Structures are given as C-alpha cells and as structure tokens.
Amino acid sequence: ITVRDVAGVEGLQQIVMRNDQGKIVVDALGTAAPSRLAVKLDWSRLSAW
Amino acid sequence: KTLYNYYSEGPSTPIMPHLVNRLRGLDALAKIDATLTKVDMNAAYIFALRPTFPYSYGYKQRFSNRRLTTSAVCYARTGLSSFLTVNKTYTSNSPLKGGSRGWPIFNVGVSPHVAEPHMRTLSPIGLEVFSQNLATFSKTLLTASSKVFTQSLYTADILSIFGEVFLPHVMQPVSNYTPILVRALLALIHILGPGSGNCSLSSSIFESSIPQFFTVSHSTNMSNRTRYCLHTWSAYKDMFRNGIPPQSTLPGSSARVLIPAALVTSPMFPWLLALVSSGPQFFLYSKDASINTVDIGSRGRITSPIPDVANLDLHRLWNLFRFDGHRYIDVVIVGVDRDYVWPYQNGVYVHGGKGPNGTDNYGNADVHDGIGTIFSSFNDNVNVQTSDLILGLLTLWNHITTTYATEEEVTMAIKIAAAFALVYPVQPIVYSGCPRAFQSHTSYYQPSSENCYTTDTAEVKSTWDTVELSVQVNNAMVLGMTLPFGQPTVSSAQWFNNIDKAEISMFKVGNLPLQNLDYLSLDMMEFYAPTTGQLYDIRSDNLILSAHRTVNLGIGYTALADFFAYLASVPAQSFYHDRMVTSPISKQTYSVYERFIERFVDDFVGWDRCDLFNLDTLLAAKRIAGVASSPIPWHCSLQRCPLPIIMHYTGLHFGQEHITVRDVAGVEGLQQIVMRNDQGKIVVDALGTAAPSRLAVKLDWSRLSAWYSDTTCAIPLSDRVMEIINYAAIWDPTQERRATGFVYTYFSPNFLSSFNASEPIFNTSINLTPPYDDTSHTVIQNLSMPQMLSFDPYYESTFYVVSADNEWIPTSGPAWKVPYLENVVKRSGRRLLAELRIASNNGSGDRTFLDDV
Amino acid sequence: NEWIPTSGPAWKVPYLENVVKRSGRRLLAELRIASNNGSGDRTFLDDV
Amino acid sequence: ITVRDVEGLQQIVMRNDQGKIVVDALGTAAPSRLAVKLDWSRLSAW
Description:
By secondary structure, chain A is α+β, with helices and mostly antiparallel strands. Chain A has two helices and two strands; from the N terminus they run E-E-H-H. Chain C: This is Capsid protein.
C-alpha cells in the first residue's frame, strides 16, 4: 500500500472523451492496470494491484 | 535546485543575503509552461494568480489516549481576490452580511525618479537622418542648407518633417518601457484577482473561481480620468506654423503619441491609451455576484449564494487602486486620409477626418474626458467576457516585450509590480487571557479577540469571532488593510444611496515611474531598430507567466515583511486605525521596520525605496471616533500570511522534533521568579524559563523553532479557554503587572476549511470537510508566528515563560496540544492533468516539425 | 554655570551634507547607549 | 568618587496598562557581596 505524496507526473495517464461537437467531457487522471504479461514477469504487480 | 533542496535548508546568520538569494531561487522556480496558455486559459489563470503552498501539520499532546491529527495536508493561500460592498442602490442603514460600506483606494502617485533609458540602434531611416544632420554643409543662400538661418531652426527643408521632430531622439537614441509593463501586470492581476479567493472583510466569503464576465461602470466623482485629443498627421501638422514641435507644449497636449494607421486597429490600442494614462477611468465589477460567491462553514460546508447577495457588488481589485499617469494625451494617427472614421466609438470625430454629417476634413479637435468616451468597449454599462478584455493586454505585453523591451526592463517591471500586487484585510488576533493564579498580577486577564469576523450561519460560529460590522467598525477595518510591505491606506471611496464620493489624501501608498510616450512613438514609427532576440527568459514574453512571477514575488514580499516585523519586533497593533493615538511606540517600531524594508528593497528590487514603501500612510492615521481597542498586550508581530507560507519563503522549520518530553531530574535551565510585597512577603515564587534573545537566535536559529514549540497552543473552537493558560503564562519584568498571556494571530475555522482544496475552486461539489479525522471540529489550528522576542524596539530585556501552579515544570515541555508544521512538495491533481496535456500528449505540429529553429 | 564649553554644545546643533543622490525620507531614532541596546536592525542588518 | 567616565549602564523600561513607557531611566547595578569579596574597592565605590 502506497502513501507517496505526489510531485511529478510519472506513472499517470490522461483519459479524454470528446463529444460530437468536440467538447471534452471527462479529461480525468488514471493509472494503467497491469497486463498478465507484466504480472508473469513480475508477480508483485498483482499484489500492488 | 528544486523545492526539495529549499525545504531541507534553514536560515543562516547573515540573514538578508540568505533571504534575498532564497527569494531569487524561488523566482527561478516559477514556471507555468506557456503552452498551457494556448489550451487552458482558466487553468493558467488559477495556477498563475492563486499559488497553493502545500504543507503538512499535526498536533501532539503528552498524557492523552485521545487520537489527534498527525500528518494532515492542507494548502495555504493569502490575499483578497476581490472585494464585496453594498450595491449603489442600497438605501437602508442596516448592515449586510459580509458587505462593506466602502472600499479603500490604494492611491499611487508619479515617481520623481525616471527609469534610466538604455541605448538603442537607429533604423535605416533614423540612421539616414542622423548621418544627414551630422553632415558638413556650407550654408550659402543659393541652396536650402541656409534655411536654418533665413527660416526658424525648426525647419523641415533639410531633414524630413519626421526627422525634424525626432531630431533630439535621433541624436540620443534611448528608450525604457518598465513604466508601461508595470501597469500591464497590475491591470491583469487586479482585473483577474490574485490570492486565496476571499472577497470580503469576512473570512467566510470566498470567490467560486476566477470571474468569467465583467461589468463596466462610470463615476464622475470617483474616476481618475484623463483628456484625449484625436487628430490626423496632416491635421496635426497644420496646428502649428508648418511643423510640430520636438518638445510638446504645456497644455490636451501634455503628451503626444504617433500611431501608424495599421496599428490603430490592433486590439492592443485601447489598452495602450490606458496603462500610460491615469487610472482607473472606469470601474469593473463581477457581472452577477450571486454565482461567483460562496460561504464556507466552520467544518467545510459550502452553502447557497450569500444571504443578502441581492444587495451586494463584487468589486475587482481594479477599483481598489489609483494610479497617476499622463493627464492630457494627443493621439495623432499618421498615414490616414481626410475621410478617416474612428473605428471604436460612434459619434467620435477625428480632427482632420470624417465629419459629423458626412463631412470631410473635420476642423475641431474635441477633447474627450476619460477613456470611456472613446473605445465603446469601455462604455458605461457594458458586459464584457474575460477573454476579450484580456486579449488586448496579452497582445500589448507580447508586442512590447518581444519588439521594444529588453530582459532587464521586464524583470524590473515584475519586481516593481510585485509591491502593489496583493491586498490583505486587517490582521485578526486572539488573546488567551491569563491563568487564574495570576489574576492579581495582570492588566490583561480576560481572553479577547480583535478583527475576527465571519458571516456564515450554516454552521456553528467560532467563539473568537465577535465582530459586529457596524459603520465605525467598518471604517476601522477598512483603514487596516495593507499592501505586501505593510502600507495601509487613508483614502477611501463610497457609492451608497446612489451617491458616489471619494476621499483621496495627499499621502500616497507609493509611486510608479511615468512612461515616456516619445519612445513609444519612435518605436511605433520604426525610427528605432527593434530589440528582437534580447529576451533570454522564456517566461518574459507571455504576460500570464510574468504575472505569475510577480504574484509569487509579492507573496514572498509579504512573507519577508512579516518575518522582518518579527525580527524587528513590530506589533500587529501598529497597523490598525489607532496606531498613532495608542502610544508612540508605533513610530519607534517603524524606525526599525523601515531599515529592514530599505535593506531588502536596496538588495533585491534595485528601485528607489521611497517609491515602494514610505511611512506616510502609517503616520496619518485617523483612529475613527467610537471604536475601542481590545484589552490585548502588544505581543503579536505583524502577520498577514499563515506560518506555512512564511516558512516556505524564509526556510524556517517547525517540525515535531522541537517538542520536548524530558522527564525532569535536575534544575538546569530553570529560573525562580519572586515578587515580594510591601512588608516582605513572597507572593509569586514560581518556576520559569528564559525566553531567547534575538542575539541567541542570530547565533542559533533552532532556538526560535523550539520557542514556537514552547508557547504555541491549538486554538479551541467552541470555548475561550486555551489549555496553555492552564499551565503557563508570560512574566514580563518591564510591565507594571508582570503576568501576561499569549496572543497569536487567528485566521478563521472557515479560512482553514478553504485550505482543504488543492485548487481555489469551491462551488458546491468540493468536499472541504476532512473525513475520518474529526479533530478540526474542536481545535482549529495555530498558524501564527511565535510570541515576539522583545516588547521594546530599542532596549533588550529578558522576560520569562512562567508556570501557573508549579505542578508543571517548564523544562518538562508543554502539557497542552502542541502544533507542528512542515513544508511539503505535493502538486495538485489539476496541475498534473495540465502537465500531462501540455507535455506528454502535446502533438501540435509546430514543435514536431519546426524544431530545427 | 554647569556647561563646560569644551564638552560640546548643549543645544540644537545643526549639521549639513551635500548629497548627490536624492533619497527619500528616513525615520531615525537617537537613543542613549546603555549596554543593553537591542534592536533588530543593529542585530541582523550588521553584515554591511 | 567618580568625576569622569565602558558600558556598565542599563536602561530600565516600565509600561502601564495603556502601553505607555513610564520609567525609561538609566541605572547601574548594585555590586554583589561576592564581587566585594573579590574586590573590596567595590564597597568603597558603593
């Protein structure tokens, strides 16, 4: 379990959903869920998951 | 360096160089990534004008099984973003919740010092004129060289007309543009509003966000207008004999600006007539204050619009300032025909242009009073979107900085504008009272408070907020507002019962250099070669980045001013309305505060001190009539920024490592305090500890931090009893009754609930109530500077922290709730989102392909 | 009787200087020297 | 008996409930019996 007072942008992604006329409606911060390949090469990633 | 390096270092013995270098380094860290200004204007505004200053805090007690806060995170902000007054149509006399009955006018005059102009290189036309008038002639009446003799020496038959006019400046090509850049920065910052979002005298009213719609307003009595005369170049030439004088005459005509016809249509032109004139020629308000204002409760509830917002006006800081510029300006417009139509206001006829009834070559040079008559975008009742009112300022700043100005001028403008950037309310201060055991040894026994004013009724009001906003209290609180360096005001304005009146005093709060319009005309007529490539700082060409720099510099200025007031032992009551009637000690403290400010300004800003900080407004207090000072000792220093911002800018450390536990065995570090009566009976005989002297703090800066750990208690919310009073008091040998309590500066529970958001946006959906903690429901916080180490500005004497019943030993450490603070590096979610949008996912095309430069 | 002329004048004694740079007003304080004179400027601004 | 005069003086400052200085006077500390013990001219000067 992480505490991690955040300073930088490392490890984060921006999620955007634009509507018909081009207006941005979501634009949220997100983190990428690990893939099964990454878990295969690193079994701790599941635990952090 | 980074914020991690600065948060790990503290002050040193040579303290002025340390503070100045730290402020320069923090200025070097003010980056907002100008690309953001092209994608998110509102986010750029919020990040630029409302800095966050994250910090961590906790409480610590000694013998309690109760679980209190340990590592909570908050975000501290300072300054008034706008002002709330009663509307012009308010007729009744009853007070309104949060609505002042008049706002101060921070009047700025003309600096006698002139900004030093630097060298310029002539354009090919200017070089032609220079090598022309420098050429050797032989007069002889056959040719025209003899026309300087047979005709007046201001002849245009050897040079051109423009060459004759600009001959003195062609001979000495110099220019300087900081006077207009300062006004541009001030205009942007005051229109949008920097700081915390608080927008009234009450600490509970806040601005929902940076406003999106403004309303103009005209006032004959209050506006500082200037006269404009519009001509054409051909018509302006015909006024005089045959050519126009190199030096403008006295009467308007006090200043002259030459504009090519291609530059008049630019959006920068109305903001160019402004920022060199005297302001404010018009007043700006928020369009509908019912949607940009919120009330924040003690626990953090954000309620419906203000209870009496229907009778309130949301003044911008634009209305709170007064600048002295040129009073008469001749707009010339060169390269235009005799049918020219003024493109900014119907019914305005240019002298020598189109006439009223379709006529040609208009013969009258009508004088227009105020920038609102021309430039219909500044008319009386006009609703203006934020973007199209700031676009002109942005274009003006970019053009001037990238064409006519240098880096030194931009930096000087930033530092000068930082002094007039923020407006702060009166400093609220509480007083814990004194322990009962010293009831017979005190002059200030009862706990009290001063300038503590909140208006929210949704939640429970703190016991320390007891200010009733009457007329006299309103005036006294208005005359306590201060600039970053601490300068208050004596001028004011009032628009009530459809009657508008301004009281402007001869004592100004500061001065700004005048802008030479001759340089403007020379640059805009391409007589000087443009200074392109003389801007090595990437933030100096935007304005929003520059405005962020000056806002950060102003917050640094006020933090350092509070720190100097603590260092010079300047009481917080020396800046109230009764600073001159109370006791002469105010001037004695000013006599050292002035030295501190003068050294800082001479070491950092590089401008004349008398323009940025005087004692004139301090020494001209009015005291009002029927407002009585609270019975509080003068033990609290001048402070407008909370502690976390102060230790961010100065480097002070107030962690939990400075709180002692120390089961006491010996007598080391303790003193015995005795008071014997007339017949020789001992009546006090208490244990005490010696408060550190400023010399010891100079040789050891940790002693101050431990001092903060020894006299600081968390302020209770629902009771007027501080647990520090149950254990300790202050023993002052220089006081007739030596026993005294503790003061502290107290902001509000609501102002601290406003610190629970990473960004200053509060409409309804923000959760300012901290969940899973509940400690803030009884104890608020202590963000004050420690007790002043000296109660005499000139002579040093030792006072003591004394015990109340000898059960508690001062050496054993505090027995109350001791707060501890720390500066933390923690970016906001929206800041990270903007960083991702402008750096990680920036496609553009001008950066993918136009990267070879 | 009690004034010794070699001890210095005992009234308001003017002094003058020329000064090139036109500076602003400064509020100064003249005090007694009592070996406990402690002021913030004299303590922290003594570097230069 | 002293006729001429470096800093054994001390400024004594006292304020009242209104914050106004009411003493502001120079003073010299009386010698301690230990000081007289180590130098008996201190008693002569006292």
